[PDB]
Amino acid sequence: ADTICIGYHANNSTDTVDTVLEKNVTVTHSVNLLEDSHNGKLCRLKGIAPLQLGKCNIAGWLLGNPECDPLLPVRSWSYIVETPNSENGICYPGDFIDYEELREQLSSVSSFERFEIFPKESSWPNHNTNGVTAACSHEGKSSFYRNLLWLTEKEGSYPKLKNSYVNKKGKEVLVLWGIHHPPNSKEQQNLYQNENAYVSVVTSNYNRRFTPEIAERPKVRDQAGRMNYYWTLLKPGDTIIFEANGNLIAPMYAFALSRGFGSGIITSNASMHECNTKCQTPLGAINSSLPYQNIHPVTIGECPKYVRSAKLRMVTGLRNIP
Amino acid sequence: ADTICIGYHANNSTDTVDTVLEKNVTVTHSVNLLEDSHNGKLCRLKGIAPLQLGKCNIAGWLLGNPECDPLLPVRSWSYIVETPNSENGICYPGDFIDYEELREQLSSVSSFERFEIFPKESSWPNHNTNGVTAACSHEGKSSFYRNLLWLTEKEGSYPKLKNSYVNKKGKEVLVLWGIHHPPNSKEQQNLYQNENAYVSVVTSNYNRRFTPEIAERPKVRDQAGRMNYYWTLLKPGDTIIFEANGNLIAPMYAFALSRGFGSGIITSNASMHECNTKCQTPLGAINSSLPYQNIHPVTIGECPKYVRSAKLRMVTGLRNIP
Amino acid sequence: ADTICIGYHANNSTDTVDTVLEKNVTVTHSVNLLEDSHNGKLCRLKGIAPLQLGKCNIAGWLLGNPECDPLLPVRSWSYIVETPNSENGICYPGDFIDYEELREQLSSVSSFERFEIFPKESSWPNHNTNGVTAACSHEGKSSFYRNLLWLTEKEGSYPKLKNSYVNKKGKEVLVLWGIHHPPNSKEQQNLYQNENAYVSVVTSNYNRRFTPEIAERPKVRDQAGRMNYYWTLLKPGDTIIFEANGNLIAPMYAFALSRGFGSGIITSNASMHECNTKCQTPLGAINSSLPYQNIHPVTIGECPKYVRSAKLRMVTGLRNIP
Amino acid sequence: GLFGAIAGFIEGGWTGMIDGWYGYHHQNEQGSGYAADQKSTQNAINGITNKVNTVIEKMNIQFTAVGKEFNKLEKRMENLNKKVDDGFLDIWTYNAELLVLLENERTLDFHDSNVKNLYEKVKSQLKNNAKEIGNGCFEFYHKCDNECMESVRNGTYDYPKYSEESKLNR
Amino acid sequence: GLFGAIAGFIEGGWTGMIDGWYGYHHQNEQGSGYAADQKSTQNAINGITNKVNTVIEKMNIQFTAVGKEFNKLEKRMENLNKKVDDGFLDIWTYNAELLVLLENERTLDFHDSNVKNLYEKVKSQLKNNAKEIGNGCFEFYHKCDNECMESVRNGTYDYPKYSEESKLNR
Amino acid sequence: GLFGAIAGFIEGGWTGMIDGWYGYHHQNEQGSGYAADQKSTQNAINGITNKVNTVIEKMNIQFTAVGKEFNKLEKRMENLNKKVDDGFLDIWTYNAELLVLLENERTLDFHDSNVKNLYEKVKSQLKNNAKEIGNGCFEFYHKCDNECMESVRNGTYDYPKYSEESKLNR
Amino acid sequence: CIEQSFTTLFACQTAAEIWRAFGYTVKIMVDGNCRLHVC
Amino acid sequence: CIEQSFTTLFACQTAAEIWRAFGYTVKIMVDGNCRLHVC
Amino acid sequence: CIEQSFTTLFACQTAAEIWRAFGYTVKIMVDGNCRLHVC
């Protein structure tokens, strides 16, 4: 006699999923939700290449450490890459004050204009501007930071100075400067004339007076003196004023900042290729529609959500029983 | 032949819900869990009206900026409202140190007693107490903060002073004071006599020595000098001591604080009405038993849980098939 | 006629569980997931006893307050217990700078070697090292911290001193020192000779110059002067240098630190017993395989996850209907 | 749906049954009418309202939450605070929406199950004294007046009582 | 319940069936007794214990967690730390309680389903060699000794073997 | 499974049915073959793909997330930041895994239900014009050519049409 | 008649409206609990 | 023929591959939505 | 006899007590896994 049977699909699938009641159920159809593949490359993001600091770090870059000269013309970037070798930073020893905050600020900068805030020949008429140091050597000559200017006595005198810059860039301007602390009083006298010298820096939302601390520190890069490095953000339309009768390492170049969201600083061992991505990790770029990934918690762009999971597979079909 | 059928309710409901398998299912009964309605008003909370700072900010309020005089008698409040116009703060230019921390402290204060910690006529017997400034003008006359006192030389001298207050209020006492920094040495001499002056302030858990910084700043409100503003909380039973031979802007009124939980500072464009609520947001008050709301993340009182959702509707009845 | 019936188990269980649809369902089998039992004791962790500070706090312990002498030989511990009576800390009044950070550092220390960084008799050849104070009395005699050394003038002079220690321990070395602030100028002169004295402390990642502040504070423990207390971590292979012409309370003993994970500082009223646990809370130790506990959020070791719940019971069997 | 009854072998609902979610329509010599099944309706309202209470109990309130301020050199702390606020908001938005979606699916399935179980309960009382005619309906092989109908509705139908007359008819 | 069997058409449980969650009670000339169904009991214990393991696996431990201290001018940081601690505790308390409530509902429904499927399995073996008498019970139209009973219990009942004698009796 | 059909009373699947998840195998004088049931297959693909979309919609992206730095005297802040990062990661890992486990269980049960409902639908059309022979199969008491078979498959089987010839045969 | 007790006002209000939609009488008693007497 | 609309690319791709595994024809239209025309 | 393997001690203990409640014999082997030999 004739028959009809009701039944369900089976196929050759070997994919498995877990449920709460049962592990490793073989199923006819399923989909992986966890991305574990990346291309092992640093890529452009939305077309724009990252800034590779190489053997330089952020401090070497923004002060203009002469070892970092290849970075000087770069104006825009999609993220910033340091490496475990990013070591060339300050070259004349001292401390960089609020460095972590500066790195945090830079993480939302997408481009800047490097400009001459105090032109070297016209800004400091009665001071020498040519001071260099063997601690910042370049091509076998004593040199100095490309964005700062060492002011010293001229003809035996270091008269009180006052210079100011009005921010007409329509953008925040990042100003860096330094304070020099000689190791002894004759260096103080030789460099700056005035034994009891001061520096002050003033904006509408920043004010600090600096007094040098004369003392012999252990030698670092052959230097017994020290140089501390400072920064502030000058708001649009504000004025910054520098006053000193010694010890000021003056700004020469500053940075008009353009903000963007989604940038950041990462550390990476990967190599730059000519590729483009929507999602970069320090291990490689991700090109995926999957909702989750277990590749890396550090992400630039628009990336799957990081989880610690080893497997996330959703069944769509049914128990496979061929 | 007779019949009986088993069946289910249908009605004229057009409400829909979503499930995981299916969107926009029309159902016979359901309930909205997401509150999206507020009354567009600032209200009292549990009976107590908020403190509306209006054109003043916290600093103008607690220093007693003369523009803020209407605030002087208020003793209790349920929350504090600033507006985008809350601009009258310090009137003699300078910095307010640890201002964010002071705002955070004030967020748990439900009332205070404003009291004369150092009575003007008896506290400073050998100093003038009448100093005013055009930077803090009121009714067309130079004036000064209502809670501080500008001490100056009397008969050509500014003798060393020491005053102390013992906290017998059984509450923390908020003490504010200021440090004046003249623009030049003749002002220093004229106001305070002593060229190398100091101020010290001491409690059991606070101690600071202040030394004036004489220098010409750009003029702000026509002032080249500066005044920095400081605060501390004097614990019950502790003593605060002020010592100076110049430059002290002395406390005159202080605040015995009563703590409560659930207060806060909000910024709002809404208007005060004669209404009462259990839940206030910067957009309006909420009167709801619903568990969630998408109105605002800033809440005073006991409010539904904020979520970004646009719809949360739970079905209670069944698929509606009339 | 013969019969067969299909059915389900029932028993005498009175355990209940809740579901979403129904509360207090009596079920045949179930398991409690929420641990609410602890043994009411402080125990060893993985064999190692905790450090009980007793009437001392961290500051009294690491400075060597003479009241804390029983702690001096302890070298390793599994966690640190303070009590509500842990009050003996600094004995000569002053501030302990970055104390919260020091406590946070100590929370990952599992042992240390207390060693003589500057031997008392050889380190300070032209200074007295025997200064004591009644503020740090012991056994009815003026005494001093066991890990620091009060240097003073010898034969009327306090010559400029410079001492340094090179860290050859292969571990971070915790160095503590103090800065003394006499109440008046004759004490300054009597103790240190030099009226305008300074102290400096220098490592590769620490540098500070201290200048005493001479003034009469209210008396605390009968002292009008003050002593501030400082610390730093000297990295392996680095050198720390002390320079002074007065006012230095010198390091004498320091601590070579061994790091471990999972340690911490707790406050507890419980008593030490001869027991061992994998999980300690301030109320008692937990010995449990359950996934959750509602005993305490503070945990040392490997503990069930803390939740606020009063009951978590999972049914494993079925509705019980005897 | 999972139990095959609602929008399934009973193709539509009844606007005429106004006094509960599940029940009966009868037709005999005396007339026709709708009547909700009171026990399953009442148990289901008890279950569904307990479910609402349970959902609400677990998250329904927040206490005062106000902004914090950070100065120009506290950008890391300000970003940390914002990461915390955004991250908790992400989690609670996810939790709230998914709890409602999942409970909605379960609620519809629960109603489907209750209809299916009421149908099977009647089926097992009538046995072969009635025939299954489609769409959730039974046609009796005997006369079933309102007393007989009520005994079906309250689960006390007496199969032996009508079985001889049913036997003759089918 | 969702499958209509437990607290449903089988109104109560059996304290006399002590060796599993589901099974059989028989009565014939040789006697009467209870016997658990071993396959469905064993599969269900396997499922339920896997479910416990899965729940436990996802959250069962915390490592050292101790308090932090803040000075008098670190109230924002102290409040930020407290917001983090309270917020994580809110989330884990919610997660733990709701996971247990939801899994408890599913567990009871799973048992109900297993009883229902065991009933239907016997029903489909016996066909019209027995009659459904209520409360999960079948009454044979033939003599069914213990060998016959065991064949029902282990799913190898031989309908043609007894069908002539059943036919004569009904 | 919960509905007793898949890996249940229909013991295995069909590699020969390649055009949907559920359907029919027939055998008559004209031949034999497989055919998916198009309506239940299409509704199920619609449901399952909506479920995937819903899961994905609720969590599928993170925006830029980069490390923060802390100096040697910011260890509390550094630990606070790490507590936040680790705690959110714990929660999202738990959420993701448990959502998939729970939805996987529901998906398999959904397929089981669809097979069960298709079986019962055919059963209720054929009534006693066919006999239930085991393993999801019916054997007709009448000749059922391909037009008859298609009417079973599309839910329009005409029981009165074949009932006399069926009656004679059983 | 039927008694229900609710720890949330919302669920109490929700339950009352369903019963009333089917023609039942509902008396509400607020006492942390919200209680329904349904007839 | 059948129309589906998806707010996620992933679900769109997932749906297309299932239909195609059963021999259906699928045209995909990307338009925030991803739409399937299934025949 | 039946073998089970558990990644958590808790679930192992839970499973052993259920089997034993029904009269089965359970031998436990702890080896990260906890294993049950059920007879």
Ligand SMILES: *[C@@H]1O[C@H](CO)[C@@H](O[C@@H]2O[C@H](CO)[C@@H](O[C@@H]3O[C@H](CO)[C@@H](O)[C@H](O)[C@@H]3O)[C@H](O)[C@H]2NC(C)=O)[C@H](O)[C@H]1NC(C)=O
């Ligand atoms: C369910 O509804 C049925 C039908 O209304 C109820 O059964 C009826 O119960 C009444 C009891 O008052 C019976 O009346 C009695 O009849 C006997 C038998 O002849 C007579 O001797 C008594 O003096 C009395 O009048 C009636 O027979 C009976 N009808 C049927 C069809 O069973 C039943 O009580 C209801 N059960 C529940 C749980 O609501």
Ligand SMILES: *[C@@H]1O[C@H](CO)[C@@H](O[C@@H]2O[C@H](CO)[C@@H](O[C@@H]3O[C@H](CO)[C@@H](O)[C@H](O)[C@@H]3O)[C@H](O)[C@H]2NC(C)=O)[C@H](O)[C@H]1NC(C)=O
């Ligand atoms: C389920 O239980 C039934 C009933 O105990 C088992 O069936 C019985 O299996 C035995 C096999 O040892 C059969 O004995 C054999 O009988 C034949 C037929 O007359 C005889 O020729 C052989 O030499 C042998 O003695 C017995 O007939 C049979 N009884 C019935 C009622 O089928 C069955 O093995 C069990 N199946 C499982 C999967 O546990």
Ligand SMILES: *[C@@H]1O[C@H](CO)[C@@H](O[C@@H]2O[C@H](CO)[C@@H](O[C@@H]3O[C@H](CO)[C@@H](O)[C@H](O)[C@@H]3O)[C@H](O)[C@H]2NC(C)=O)[C@H](O)[C@H]1NC(C)=O
């Ligand atoms: C489900 O499949 C069945 C079987 O293929 C379809 O029923 C068939 O429908 C056709 C309509 O073209 C019927 O043909 C008509 O037959 C009548 C009756 O003798 C004749 O007078 C007409 O001129 C016409 O040729 C055919 O009888 C009918 N067969 C059966 C067994 O019912 C049905 O249309 C399909 N339904 C759906 C919803 O797909």
Ligand SMILES: *[C@@H]1O[C@H](CO)[C@@H](O[C@@H]2O[C@H](CO)[C@@H](O)[C@H](O)[C@H]2NC(C)=O)[C@H](O)[C@H]1NC(C)=O
């Ligand atoms: C991202 O991955 C997709 C594949 O998943 C790439 O799309 C393929 O591109 C190749 C060109 O090399 C085409 O031949 C294929 O037809 C495409 N496949 C699909 C499914 O679209 C895409 O190019 C990748 N994008 C980037 C930026 O790497």
Ligand SMILES: *[C@@H]1O[C@H](CO)[C@@H](O[C@@H]2O[C@H](CO)[C@@H](O)[C@H](O)[C@H]2NC(C)=O)[C@H](O)[C@H]1NC(C)=O
């Ligand atoms: C909060 O809202 C409820 C309504 O949801 C208000 O209660 C109503 O108050 C009016 C008076 O204007 C009464 O006539 C109604 O009978 C009340 N309805 C209910 C459902 O209780 C309540 O007054 C509101 N409270 C506030 C403070 O605005």
Ligand SMILES: *[C@@H]1O[C@H](CO)[C@@H](O[C@@H]2O[C@H](CO)[C@@H](O)[C@H](O)[C@H]2NC(C)=O)[C@H](O)[C@H]1NC(C)=O
């Ligand atoms: C932790 O608790 C378990 C019990 O849950 C203890 O194990 C028992 O130890 C006693 C010895 O006093 C034995 O006689 C029992 O047979 C053990 N029972 C089980 C179930 O293992 C264990 O000793 C406890 N551990 C600690 C460190 O307290």
Ligand SMILES: *[C@@H]1O[C@H](CO)[C@@H](O)[C@H](O)[C@H]1NC(C)=O
């Ligand atoms: C499995 O089946 C698919 C679809 O029918 C086919 O394309 C593939 O070649 C098969 N693979 C194996 C290994 O059988």
Ligand SMILES: *[C@@H]1O[C@H](CO)[C@@H](O)[C@H](O)[C@H]1NC(C)=O
């Ligand atoms: C819908 O039904 C409700 C309840 O029967 C009734 O009160 C209302 O007026 C109806 N509305 C419309 C638009 O039919």
Ligand SMILES: *[C@@H]1O[C@H](CO)[C@@H](O)[C@H](O)[C@H]1NC(C)=O
């Ligand atoms: C309940 O039943 C268990 C298992 O049969 C038995 O061991 C126990 O003694 C009983 N307790 C009571 C109070 O009946």
